[PDB]
Design a protein around this ligand. Sequence first.
Ligand SMILES: C=C[C@@]1(F)CN(C2CCCC2)c2nc(Nc3ccc(C(=O)NN4CCN(C)CC4)cc3OC)ncc2N(C)C1=O
Ligand SMILES: [Zn+2]
Length: 293
Amino acid sequence: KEIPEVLVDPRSRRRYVRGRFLGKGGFAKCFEISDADTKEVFAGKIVPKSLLLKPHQREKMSMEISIHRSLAHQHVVGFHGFFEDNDFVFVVLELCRRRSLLELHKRRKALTEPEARYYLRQIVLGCQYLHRNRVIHRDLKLGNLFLNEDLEVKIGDFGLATKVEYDGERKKVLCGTPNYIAPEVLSKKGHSFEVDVWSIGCIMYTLLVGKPPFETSCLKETYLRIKKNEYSIPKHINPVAASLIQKMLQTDPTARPTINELLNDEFFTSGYIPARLPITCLTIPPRFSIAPS
Ligand SMILES: C=C[C@@]1(F)CN(C2CCCC2)c2nc(Nc3ccc(C(=O)NN4CCN(C)CC4)cc3OC)ncc2N(C)C1=O
Ligand SMILES: [Zn+2]
């Protein structure tokens, strides 16, 4: 059951030449795809219906599209359309040519504090937007924070995202395995937006420390630690940073900052936030000199 060389959308009359394989995110296989008219290049997410035999699995795809199609923001992955044939579902997404913060972290490990500020601010801005529109992402991790050509963060993968339908709603269920799973999810006693503030907490730790907050050999031993709040921040981490991590990584959901509180935190306001990063920042730690030589 092989994927077409050209992807034709009969409704919009659009044709996409299937370009080079990018990798296999989940059930989906991802390719650079180019529109035949505009020549505009996109990221195609192609999932075979043979893996969507069950309504439950079909419904998760549908919801992902439902949620992601309704979003437009600078730090959210552009959703440009979807369509299907008898064998596949095709989703046309914003190509993010510098991959994700995961690939950056693999190369650089711990970032400089300004780099963290730069990225975390964009992670927070997109996540503020989701929350404003009642969307919880629920799997914010380095692999889901994509980078465009200018190293701007674009929040992607809405396969666990859920829409809050009514004020004060606690989601009882999360069908999936998020990377930075909040303790209220692991305890299985309800959760809302504060789940995303947890993950951002873990992302900040990881960006600054160079490894995740609760990491172990065993995945269940890690879950043990998240419940128990078993983690510690190295001494070389600056107090203002370490304070904000501690605020975000509280077992109590109600005790964490809201998404609209974060950028007013001392970490952002009393520290240097680059306007932009150079592409060398993918490879080499930037020093942020005041002038060249
Ligand atoms: C459908 C898009 C996708 F679903 C998935 N991702 C990634 C996650 C893993 C699969 C693609 C996106 N990626 C990309 N771009 C790229 C991913 C991987 C490689 C790249 O260099 N790939 N290499 C990996 C090593 N291989 C041996 C060669 C290909 C190169 C990329 O851009 C040129 N843009 C957007 C997305 N988004 C937002 C999505 O939602
Ligand atoms: Zn399920």
